[PDB]
């Protein structure tokens, strides 16, 4: 399973840790920000582009609050990014929203919790079915 990761200056540290974690667990990681991005807009849009052009369906964005990477990346037509700070949304957003990426706020979420969030997100598959109508609606928007 491929995973696209990216981060700005505030999220870089955790991104580096998560990268190590992912590699240790046989995940093929595509880091779009070997060096911290100028800001969360650059990092979030970079992850989005790599994701929407790759055959990967999992991505993780890192910044100080998460809010920014999602706000910016969601402006991209077809993109669906979920800010995640707890363990229920971690999997539900993948199951129902097919979230193409999740955003983690390093100033909001501690490392140990982030890992539980991340692993739950990665282990969950989009359920499709009735949920597809909402996804069709979102991908239709600007």
């Amino acid at each position: 399973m491929d995973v696209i990761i990216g981060a700005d200056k505030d999220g870089f540290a955790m991104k580096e840790q998560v990268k190590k974690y992912l590699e240790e667990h046989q995940y093929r990681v595509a880091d779009v920000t070997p060096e911290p991005a100028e800001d969360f807009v650059e990092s979030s849009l970079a992850v989005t582009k790599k994701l929407l052009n790759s055959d990967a369906h999992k991505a993780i964005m890192f910044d100080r609050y998460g809010v920014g990477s999602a706000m910016a990346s969601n402006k991209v037509k077809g993109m669906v990014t979920a800010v995640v700070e707890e363990e229920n949304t971690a999997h539900m957003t993948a199951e129902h929203n097919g979230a193409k990426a999740i955003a983690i706020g390093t100033g909001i979420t501690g490392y140990d919790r982030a890992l539980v969030i991340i692993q739950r997100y990665l282990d969950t598959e989009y359920a499709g079915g009735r949920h597809q109508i909402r996804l069709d609606m979102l991908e239709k928007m600007i």
Binding site: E86, E87, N88, D112, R113, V116
Partner: peptide, 8 residues
């Protein structure tokens, strides 16, 4: 109030 610390 979180899954992580509960499991711990």
């Amino acid at each position: 109030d979180d899954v992580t610390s509960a499991v711990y």
